[PDB]
């Protein structure tokens, strides 16, 4: 059958995803001001509209009004949609803006990017242009493209007076962008304490607190937490309110190692062990990221040193997996459970070995961890270091007296595993430290079995050069050559044959590798085995030679290489069947033709007296029966039953095959030993069209 189920990554996947969900997702956007070209190209108003816009940017109200009287539409814009009022408002020309307003320019005209004149002036920091526009009736809460407001633009660039003015005129602090950010958010993102203090001075607060947790802004964090009261329910407090990802401010500060803002939050009542997602605590985040002092503060403030995620990761697990040997040492000195286990039984040592972190293994074994502590499937840390090909941790583990022959759950030894994953470095190292070259699993696979079946040619080479006999058998009786042929690894088969492998080794059913190569159609491997003195007439227990198998499975090319190599063309099995009988049994038509072209007897007979025509008559094989009749098979031959193939076709209701038989001169008035004719069988079985077709 299949040997793939007989021969750990899906085990690693779950805790790997639970350590992947310890990430924090996001910065507020920054506005970029518009670009101005001034080119003439923009129907005879081209050079005039263009020179007019140039005059508006340069700030010359003389040539601008003189141009306006020359009959140029005031709502004239360039490629991007910029008005004379936009160009004037960006540059602080207060007079040009006043005259442009009186001359008839619209206040709330927006470019292609949706910025009104008030937008442009706010981002640029023209306090007086803003005063003119606000007093003239401009929409102070105008949302540009993506929803930015002038208050947002001023707060982003720390234009303080613009912010004080827009707040005095009543600008909405709450109006957020398309993704949810307010002026306070970007003011915190840029590090403008002045702005932040001003916007917080009059009347939103929570996402600002999360940004302050990322930014280590203790000033703004202390400012945001003055209206929140130390209630008896920590969940209601603003210091413990979460993002959309379930993370609290303390979780975030733990992610960025921000010790100061974390101390502030904890002093304002931030709860130290609030879980997010599948049980992730701030200790888990700080530990995964290696933030040593964050871990120190969290433990000092009553953090659970042994808290488990859903699958069982403790903070020491996370720190060990990530190679944060300082957090590992701190956690260990504070008394972390050295042998806490995940749901599949992994110790922190298994994680540290899984990430090739030598220093974490050194500190873990220093604190008396058992070097051969096993998982639930009995995988030592050396097993994991071998599965990952990590050379350094394998060297250290072996140097600290880890057993290189440790048997795993299925009998697998670190050498077996390093051989299944093609780790030449780790395999050679394990052998140096005493791994048994020819140790077997519970299913009897040596390392050369595993490497040969998996096609790792260099490993097969190294094992063969180290003294691995390729003729060790598994519980199915198969040597490395059998499985190397079952999987189709041609180069490995050549390497085994060239290095003394038995060509015709017998397994269960006394079958050689040639039988398996014929069953699976491995044509090139049939060639390779035959070339190395494989007897092509080798028979199994039921009597099949490789020719019989090609006749059963329909492999025509294999039958070709076999017959050209001298395979006996009409050999008997236990039931006395020749390859032609088998071809007539399984409908292999081409193999039957190729068989007959090679001097195969058209009507060979077994112990029972049957001919391939009888067989084809039984199994309702029309084309092969026809090919036999054409090649010279008699339809009047009998068996031990006195049966012609016409009796057989008559009993089992073979309409077409009996048609071919009668058309080829099949005797109808033929009797058996017990006085039976095909009319008696045809009538007894209950076939109408049959008995009709006889007469």
Author numbering: 1582 to 1588, 1601 to 1618, 1622 to 1638, 2026 to 2186, 2191 to 2682
What does the paper say about this structure?
Although AnkB and G do not contain AnkR_CT like sequences in their tails, more thorough sequence analysis revealed that both AnkB and G contain a 13-residue segment (denoted as ‘AI-a’ for the AutoInhibition segment-a) that share a similar sequence pattern with the last 13-residue fragment of AnkR_CT and several MBD ‘site-1’ binding targets such as Na+ and K+-channels. As an alternative approach, we replaced the corresponding sequence of AnkR_CT with that of AnkB_AI-a and produced an AnkR/B_CT Chimera. Isothermal titration calorimetry (ITC) experiments detected a strong interaction between this chimera peptide and AnkB_MBD, with a Kd value comparable to that of AnkR_CT with AnkB_MBD. This chimera peptide was fused to the N-terminus of AnkB_MBD for crystallization trials as we have demonstrated for AnkR_CT. With this strategy, we successfully obtained crystals of the AnkR/B_CT Chimera/AnkB_repeats_R1-20 fusion protein, and the crystals were diffracted up to 3.3 Å. The structure of the fusion protein was determined by the molecular replacement method using the AnkB_repeats_R1-24 structure as the model. Consistent with the biochemical analysis, the structure showed that the AnkB_AI-a segment binds to ‘site-1’ of AnkB_MBD (repeats_R1-5) using essentially the same binding mode as we observed in the AnkR_CT/AnkB_MBD and Nav1.2_ABD/AnkB_R1-9 complex structures. In particular, Glu1630 from AnkB_AI-a occupies the identical position as Glu1622 in AnkR or Glu1112 in Nav1.2 on AnkB_R1-5, by forming strong hydrogen bonds with Thr94 and Asn98 in the R2-R3 finger loop. Additionally, hydrophobic interactions between ‘PPIV’ from AI-a and hydrophobic residues from R3-R5 also contribute to the binding.
Ankyrins are a widely expressed scaffold protein family, which mainly function to link great varieties of functionally related but structurally diverse integral membrane proteins to the spectrin-based cytoskeletons. Each ankyrin contains an N-terminal membrane binding domain (MBD), which is composed of 24 ANK repeats and responsible for binding to diverse membrane targets. Following the MBD is an unstructured linker region of ~130 amino acid residues, followed sequentially by a ZU5-ZU5-UPA supramodule responsible for spectrin binding (SBD), a death domain (DD), and an intrinsically disordered C-terminal tail (CT) with varying lengths. We identified three distinct autoinhibitory segments from the intrinsically disordered linker and CT regions of AnkB, and elucidated the inhibition mechanism of these segments by detailed biochemical and structural investigations.
